[PDB]
Symmetry: C4
């Protein structure tokens, strides 16, 4: 009998061909939708629907109270990071709540200390707890999700992540998650794929997680690796209901951390929460910087405008229809035709 053409005799050793955002384009389809008439609302969780299907990452260079307020006012939501004392994270929940009953989420880990944190976040009025771990396919993480759902699930929605497989998503669904957050390896500041050799290209990860979550009515949050507004449309078309953004929002005025003026231009610090600086285990993230991008409201407007254009091209009046769109797979040469090419760009563009 002939070997598997990539080696050995086990056809399941190399189990899948993983596609990322740059591997696919959305195909145009028959459409009565124009960007103005598209409806961008979508479920964050079973019970919570957002006007704009975007949430900010639970990172100490992305989301504290000002980002959470701005995201909610723009129609999305912030997830407050957990790299700070319990009392301060709960205080920031209260700061968001005092700004008009805006929606807010907050991350917690797993274990006794994370439980105390979760309880004080609930008492502070948080709408969404995000059980936020590097590898959610673990009974301790599943136990955390289910125990939160058991004890405070009437009052608060409970998200679990992160996963990158159908079986891991199914495990979180069975534990009672109100949403499943997908992404192991794809983040712009993540080094898991080189440090551990572990990951899953995000379009395939979403397609697999959605195969478990969609039939259970559980929304999927696509988390990490989105670098363009078009990636939002691709993630939702692969079946996610919202996207979580770190890099694309770290450059905004509302993101915490230093505004850096270096060699005539403007940047802001952006670092993985598994980086050496954030943990102060070998690090699984880097510390870096992103270009300054101005007010959050303006960035969100550009991102949602790109999503609306995709809905016009695909004939999607709603995100639920966009989730039914088809991809074409592209080659490395198609990636060059898919970006502007063979021209020296001379003027600034707001979305490129």
């Amino acid at each position: 009998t002939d070997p598997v053409p990539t080696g050995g005799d086990d056809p399941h050793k190399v189990a899948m061909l993983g596609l990322t955002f740059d591997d696919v384009l959305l195909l145009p389809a028959a459409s009565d939708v124009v960007p103005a008439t598209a409806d961008t609302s979508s479920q964050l969780t079973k019970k919570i629907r957002l006007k704009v299907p975007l949430v900010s990452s639970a990172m100490d260079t992305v989301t504290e109270s000002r980002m959470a307020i701005a995201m909610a006012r723009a129609g999305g939501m912030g997830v407050l990071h957990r790299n700070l004392p319990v009392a301060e994270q709960a205080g920031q929940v209260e700061m968001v709540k005092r700004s008009g009953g805006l929606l807010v989420g907050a991350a917690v880990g797993v274990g006794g200390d994370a439980w105390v944190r979760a309880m004080m976040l609930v008492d502070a009025g948080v709408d969404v707890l995000v059980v936020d771990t590097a590898h959610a396919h673990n009974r301790l993480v599943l136990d955390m999700v289910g125990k939160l759902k058991s004890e405070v699930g009437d009052r608060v929605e409970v998200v679990g992540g992160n996963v990158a497989t159908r079986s891991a998503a199914a495990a979180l669904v069975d534990a009672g998650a109100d949403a499943v957050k997908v992404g192991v390896g794809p983040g712009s500041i993540c080094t898991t794929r080189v440090v551990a050799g572990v990951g899953a290209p995000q379009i395939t990860a979403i397609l697999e997680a959605v195969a478990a979550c969609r039939p259970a009515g559980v929304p999927v949050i696509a988390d990490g690796g989105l670098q363009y507004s078009g990636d939002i449309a691709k993630a939702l078309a692969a079946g996610a209901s919202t996207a979580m953004l770190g890099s694309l929002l770290a450059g905004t005025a509302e993101a915490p951390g230093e505004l850096i003026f270096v060699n005539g231009k403007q940047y802001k610090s952006y670092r993985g929460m598994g980086s050496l600086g954030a943990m102060r285990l070998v690090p699984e993230g880097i510390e870096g910087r992103v270009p300054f991008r101005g007010p959050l409201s303006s960035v969100i407007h550009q991102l949602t405008g790109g999503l609306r254009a995709a809905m016009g091209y695909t004939g999607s009046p709603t995100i639920e229809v966009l989730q039914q769109a088809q991809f074409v797979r592209i080659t490395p040469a198609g990636l060059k035709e898919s970006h502007p090419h063979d021209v020296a760009m001379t003027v600034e563009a707001p979305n490129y």
Copy 2:
């Protein structure tokens, strides 16, 4: 049952593998054709045949009256852009017509204002109306094409675009289009693929559109992404009847806009019509520059010479036979062998 190897359980979610120009080469075949004896004529529309199968883009940095005159004199045609008052666009049609009864086209949009524009262009003597939209697979665009064909179709040919699928091309055929223009995403200055995440690699887009248009006897115009004279031959071999060029013609003396002398070299402005500067929706194009390339006549001579060489290699005495040629698909390493490699180029080449 086993999942689709790229994810999920739907084998049609990723519907196609899209090839662009750089993914294929034309195979040599038995030939009695030399470049001198090839016949490059081809249908622009059902009724209009061009000596040279090339048209200039309807862009305000590519085609006003001087480009339209020069293109017609070279055996092709210009499509006058519509980013100017109706009276001025109609005036430029008259300027071309007063230069010897040369062929000319002009772009219009969709709606009442575009209708008034179309009527004055017809009164000015235009030969071809191009209903020119980002996404033609829309009943309003189809209605525009059919109503123009109904009211003025005896006097003028009516082109509709742009499309990137078989179903969208078929819809324009059924609406009565005299030609179908193909290209969503491929243009050198286009950012639709990153802003919206939408597009289709152009060789596959042409092959699919031709599968609908060729059996209906409707010519296909391949529009966008052509960067070399060899790309003209590839587009026609995939079944298109003409190619529309923006970047390759924007650098010519006849293209409107500024001749820029920067750091000792010469450039000209070239910008998407969906760029911020041209619209003055989030932009779907960039503003940039291309190297100055001299007189249009000389550029067209180089492009048609490359097409003639392809016809010699493929044994194609006519464009209709070139449309029957075969491709070989290449890998990323083949792309390096397909360009000149491992040599420092020391002398200027007119076509490279």
Copy 3:
């Protein structure tokens, strides 16, 4: 009958599709393992188990006595290079042995002189002889392995390499090898693939060699091409039992050769043993430099920490379970998402 789509009529002419480390990621799986509880021990040979599944290359810029001592103290092993007099190589074996009964290996070639070298290494107390050749699939190399096993195999373990195919691995198993070392072409300083045109991508090479060695109970050493700690996890998941490292260890304080201070930074010499400088046949290696990386102990800690993270993600409590993990194959775009992207890295990372 139709040709093979890549050419000719022989479907076995292009026999395999070879994957390297960058072509695959490890998939997360259900896990009760955290990095702290993983057990990284693994068989170097049939009889020798290491606490850390790492050995240093038998190269004159990687392993002399200080590297061998440090590797053994860290839980792995050094293989002393053979580009020096027999008496000196045997002396370095004694130096390692006098430092606490640490494990040590030493390379030998093939023939009468290599036999004398092997005998004096055994008399000096060496634990592992490595019959170390460019192409082990040769009866002279197989004879060397079997004769060593026959004469001194009670006292010392005998490794043979290098191979890159199932049939070559099977030949070494039949000759009596206590381990099989895999890698033809992949080394960072190797030029065999361009000089001879010969090689095999290392993930496929390991999968094929393991298909012969694993059913015979013979451990596989993955040798060459590992550039990140995640590559260690990938090699072991493909079925190898240990990894051999040149580049990743050449930058350490214990590696022999010059510490180079050039343009404000620190490097160390690193050269192929088939390079012109090491042989003083056309060369099959280059002479170069790698960044200085500090003490070996610290490098090994970072590499094993990355391996432990992979074991946590894959649910592997032991290396034997990690050998059962699954890959996802990635595209060239996935390689960019798999490295940190779209951020200017501003702070040093210990493992990236």
Copy 4:
């Protein structure tokens, strides 16, 4: 019925997947061959066997009399270029012949003038006429080959080229060619692939041509695109009997043209014969420069040493056995592992 996944309904429109040298590696196999004992002799034509399976390109920056003499003395052969008067090309044939009865070839075109040239080359003592054209799959080229074979074929061997398909190779075999030269598009200075859009990746081109020529006993010359000594082994393994080199030999002392000292280093002019400068049709080649590489004899020694290493790895005692070797196909990531990587090269290598 479902479309072809790359577009349209014709499964033969994209007829093949073309591999180039960088797409494949030779697999190691069981071997009693070492580089010293390999036999590199091979048929140039039906009647002519060379000690070294290498010929120099018929280019005015590669082969005049000094290169032809040096190539013959090294065991290969030169093909004198035809971009000079008939009397001078015939004179250079005589110059080679007066240097010890060395073998020599000379290029001719097609038509009456090429016939006069061929007759005077035969009278001057040439051993091989090379009917040398951009596209040999043409009855005029086939007629030239057959008429030369009819009139002078007792005295001289007749080669025809260039082709890139099985059908074109078969046509030259039927015309009576004593060898078939393969390569449309691959040359380092060639721009046919971008100017005309025409070509065929060279490994697939050789495999297809060999499928026609080998069963007829007609040797195949692999011409163009070879950039490393390992590419020689790959071309012969794909079934070619000799390789023709332009770039790799243009940098030698014996190549005609200027030795250029620019910014402290040494180069020599190298230009396509379809470049503007050589023709003084749109050009299908560029004018450039290559690094100076010293005496031809030394370059040939390095190239043949790499070929001998490949024969050792593949177990090929003769070129006829090397023609039976197998490839592994590699990915873009394998191309990086196949070159030296992640090391700053600090010392010159003679073959890299």
